[PDB]
Swiss-Prot record, chains A, B, C, D:
SUPFAM superfamilies given in the database record: Cysteine proteinases
Family from the record: Belongs to the arylamine N-acetyltransferase family.
Quaternary assembly: Monomer and homodimer.
Aminoacyl-tRNA synthetase in keyword set: no
Statement: the UniProt record of this protein carries the keyword Manganese: no
Origin species: Salmonella typhimurium (strain LT2 / SGSC1412 / ATCC 700720)
E.C. no: 2.3.1.118, 2.3.1.5
InterPro entries hit by this protein: Arylamine_N-AcTrfase, Papain-like_cys_pep_sf
Protein name: Arylamine N-acetyltransferase / N-hydroxyarylamine O-acetyltransferase
Pfam families from the UniProt entry: Acetyltransf_2 (PF00797)
Role according to the record: Catalyzes both the acetyl-CoA-dependent N-acetylation of aromatic amines and the O-acetylation of N-hydroxyarylamines. In vitro, catalyzes the O-acetylation of N-hydroxy-Glu-P-1, and the N-acetylation of isoniazid and 2-aminofluorene.
C-alpha cells in the first residue's frame, strides 16, 4: 500500500516503495532518510517559527526540500513508518553529551518501533552522531551501524545511548519508555528554539549523511567531509554567497519555495550575528 | 504609466489606474486603500515575523489578501504613491492617545506627500481612527475627512493630530518631519510586535473601511459596524469557527495562501490565550 | 518571474505567484481562475461593446473585477499562461449542446497547452459546465475534474467533449487544432453579441465556481447554489435592487469603476426587457 | 450661486461664473459653449453607446473634454442654464436642410428659454450652422448672431428656422413648442446613431466655434478654417496620426480619459471604413 504522503516521502528519499513493515524495511528507510533529509536548524536562527503538525512537516521537509532537527526529522519519519504499517510512537530523552552537572530537560525526540516481536529505537534527528540504523533495546550488546558503533546501558527503567570513541563507550543521551504527546514535542521545540542559552540559537548547524560511512558537516562556515568515519577534507567557506551555494550543492537544501525558502540576503543577516 | 506592482495594487484596490499624481488622485487612492486592505495584527498574535521589504509587503498585503498595521500598510501605500509619481517619504510619530505620562517611542509610521507645492500627510495605518483622506500640513484649520474631522496642531518642531471625540478633541499621535530609514521601521515593528507591554500582543485587532462613512471593527470577539460614524449593530461572535468566517466575509481576509495563510485551528490557539 | 500583468492576475486570483509552467501549475491556475473571475454576459445585454485586446481585457476582468465569456475569459487566461511561460494558443470550436440540426459556427474559444511533452486543453470560458482543470488530448479516457467527469472523443480531425449528464453523456462543444487569429475571435464575439438569435442577447447569465465542487448560477432572477454537483438551495431573487446586491455579494462583481462599472438603474433597464 | 456641476461647467467654458439669469448671461454662455465644447459624432462611428443622463453628459462633455451632438450638447447646456436659474426645457425639431420630400422625424434637440417675459430659443448642438446666440421667438424679424443672420417663419403653431445664403432665406429645421421627455431624446439619439441611413454613421464630423465669427470644420480628413463666415485655409489632413493630432490641437478633444477617451488606433479603424 501507498498513501498520498508516503508517496512524496519515497520520492524525496530517492528510494523505492515498501509496503511490508520489517526490520529490513526499517534498516533501509532509516539510512535513506539520513541521506536525503538534512539536519538543519536554520529556521531557528533566521527567526521563523517551527510547526510540528504533519503538513507543515510535509511541506517543509518534503516539498520544500528543507531540513530540521529532533522534532521535525523524527516527526516526519514517524509518520512514514506509521503509514507503512509499523508500530511506532515518539520518545523524549535528555541530551547528556556535554556531560552536564544535572540532568537537562527532554530536548530530544526519537522513535520506538515494534518490529517482529522486538523493540527497536530509530532516530534520524540527533544530528552529527545520529543513528543511521535501528538498534535493539538491549544493554551491553555493542550494536553496529553504517556510521558507528553504539551500546545502550540499562540504568533502572531509563536507558542511556552510547557510541565508541577512543576505545571507551560514550553516552549521548538518556531516555525511558514513557508516552509523549504532540504538545510535549511542541514544548521541546519551544525550549530548543527560544531558551536563550540553547546552543541552536548560536550557530548554524547542518549535517547530511552519505552511502558509504560518509557524512557532511557544516557549523557556520566550517564545512567538513567524512569517509568511513574519518575527516577527509575540511573547507572553511569564505563568504555568505559561497555558503548559500554550498547549502544547495552539498546538502541539497531547497533554497526556494513560496513558503519555506529563504533569500541569500537572509542567510547573510543570520551569519552576520556571529 | 503602470509598473508591475502598481498593477496588482490597483487590482486589489478594486480601482481604476491613475497615472497623474495630484491631490485628487491621492484623495481617492487613500480611501481606496482604506477600504480594500484591512488593518490587522494577526501575525503578531500567532507568532509570525513581519518582514517590511517591498515584496514581502507585496505578497502579504496584495497577493495573499491580508492586512497589517502602521509599517506594513503605509509601507505598501508609500510604494504605490511613489510608482504613481508622487513625492513621498515615511515619518515616525508617537502614539499619545492613552495620554501617557511621558512621550512614548516612535511606534507609528505615516506618509508625507508633496503634491502641488503643498505638503500633505497620508496615513492608512493607524487603525480605528486612521485618516481616510490626505490632510494639509497646517495648524488650527479643522480639516475634513470621509470618516471624521481631524484638527492638526503645532508646538515647536512637532505636530499633534486629533479627531472630534465625544465633542472635545483627543490627541492621537504626533511627529516631526525628520527623515526615517527602513531600519527605523524595522525597529518600530520590532518594538510593537515584541515589547511585552505592547497592546498589539494582547488582543486581535481588525478594522476595515466602507464607502459611506462606515467602517468595521473587530477586537477579539467584539464585532461592530459603523455608519456615518455611528455604532449601528454590535455582534459578539460566539466561537472561533464563526470568527474565522467573519474574517473572510466582513474584512475579506485571504485566509489561504501557501505563505501568509493560516488555518482556523491556528486562530483558535490565538484566541485561546485570552 | 513576474510581469506587470501577471502581477494583478495573481492578485485577482487570490493566489500565490507561480513561475514554473507545469501541469500542476496549470491544474491550480485553472481552478483559481474559475473561482475568481465570473462568467458574465452583462455587457451584451446593456448594449456595450466588448473589446478583446489585452488591456481592455486587463481593465475589465482584473481592475474592474468584472466577468466575461468565451473570448474574454480564455483571452485573459491565455495571456497569463503565456507570461508564466507555458506554450499556448487559442482554438475555436462549435457549441453543439442543444444538439443542432447542422453544425453551428465557431462561437467558442478555448485553450491548447503544451506541458511536459503532452497536449492539454484548458477552458475557463464555457460557463455553466466549463472545465475546472486541464484535460489531456485523448479519446475515451474518462478524465476527471473538480466539478465533473468529462469524456473527450474522436471522429476525424475534430474532437467532441462531454460531461456526465443525468447519466448518459451530452456532447457540449467540439473543435479542431486549427490556428486562430485575434480577428477570428473578434468575429466570434461579434456573432455572439449581435446575431439576433444568439441566446446571450436574451437573458442575463452569471456563473462562478467555488472550492469544493460547488458553483453559483444566475439566469435572470433564478439564482442557484451547488455543492459537489448538487442543487443545494435555489433562490428566486425578487427585485432588481436585490439582484444588484447579489451580483456583488455572491459573484463579486465590481459594480463600480470609472469605465466598466454600471449603475443599478442600468441593470433594471436590462432586466426590464424580459 | 454655484452648484457642483455649474462649477466645472464654467471651468470648461474658460469663463467667469454668472448667477443672474438674463438675456445677456444667455448671450455669452451660448457663445462660450459654442467655442469650448465641440460638435462631434465620434462615439457613433467607433461603435460606443451614447448615454444622455446628466452624469454621463457631465463626464463626457466636461471631464473628458469631449464633444457630442444635438442631444448631448443641448442636454448639458440645458442643465447649466437651469442651475443658473433660467427657465428652460428642450424641444424636438425636424431637420429639413436637405429639403426632403416628406417631413423627417424629430432628430434635433434645442432649447426654449424664458428670459425677461420673452421666449428665446438657444441651440448649441446643430453643428455647422448652429446658432451662436439666443433668438427671439418671432417671425420675419431677421435676427443677428456672431456667426450669421437668421429668420424664423410662423407656419401655423409650428416654426421654421432659417439663415441667409446668397440673398435668400434658407430653412434649417422646423419645430413646435410641444413638451418632450428624456426618453424622447433617447429615442432621437437611438435613431440618429443607429438608423442605417443616418448620415452620422457615414462620416466623421467635428465643428468648433471661435470668438471672431470664425469656426473650424472637420469632415473626415477635410479640415477648414473660417473667419467672419469665410473659408480661410482648407487643409486636407494626410493621415490618421496627423488627424489624431488635429483633434486635440484645433478642437481641443480630450483624447485620453479612463472612460471616454480613445486610442489613435481606434480612430484609424473608424476612418478605415471610408
Amino acid at each position: 500500500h501507498m498513501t498520498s504522503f508516503l508517496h512524496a516521502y519515497f520520492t524525496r528519499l530517492h528510494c523505492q516503495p515498501l509496503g511490508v513493515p520489517t526490520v529490513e524495511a526499517l534498516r533501509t528507510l532509516h539510512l535513506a532518510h539520513n541521506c536525503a533529509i538534512p539536519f538543519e536548524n536554520l529556521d531557528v536562527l533566521l527567526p521563523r517559527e517551527i510547526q510540528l503538525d504533519e503538513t507543515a512537516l510535509e511541506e517543509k521537509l518534503l516539498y520544500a526540500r528543507r531540513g530540521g532537527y529532533c522534532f521535525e526529522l523524527n516527526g516526519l519519519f514517524e509518520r512514514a513508518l506509521r503509514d507503512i504499517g509499523f508500530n511506532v510512537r515518539s520518545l523524549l530523552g535528555r541530551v547528556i553529551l556535554s556531560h552536564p552537572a544535572s540532568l537537562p530537560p527532554r530536548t530530544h525526540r526519537l522513535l520506538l518501533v515494534d518490529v517482529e516481536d522486538e523493540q527497536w529505537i530509530a532516530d534520524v534527528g540527533f544530528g552529527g552522531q545520529t543513528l543511521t540504523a535501528p538498534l535493539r533495546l538491549q544493554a551491553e550488546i555493542a550494536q553496529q551501524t553504517p556510521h558507528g558503533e553504539y551500546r545502550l546501558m540499562q540504568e533502572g527503567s531509563t536507558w542511556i545511548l552510547q557510541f565508541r570513541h577512543h576505545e571507551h563507550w560514550q553516552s549521548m543521551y538518556c531516555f525511558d519508555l514513557g508516552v509523549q504527546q504532540q504538545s510535549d514535542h511542541v514544548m521541546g521545540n519551544f525550549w530548543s528554539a527560544h531558551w536563550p542559552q540553547s546552543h541552536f540559537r548560536h550557530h548554524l548547524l547542518m549535517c547530511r549523511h552519505l552511502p558509504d560511512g560518509g557524512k557532511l558537516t557544516l557549523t557556520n562556515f566550517h564545512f567538513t567531509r567524512y569517509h568511513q568515519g574519518h575527516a577527509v577534507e575540511q573547507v572553511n567557506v569564505p563568504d555568505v554567497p559561497s555558503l548559500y551555494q554550498l547549502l544547495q550543492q552539498q546538502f541539497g537544501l531547497g533554497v526556494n519555495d513560496v513558503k519555506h525558502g529563504f533569500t541569500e540576503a537572509e542567510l547573510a543577516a543570520v551569519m552576520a550575528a556571529f
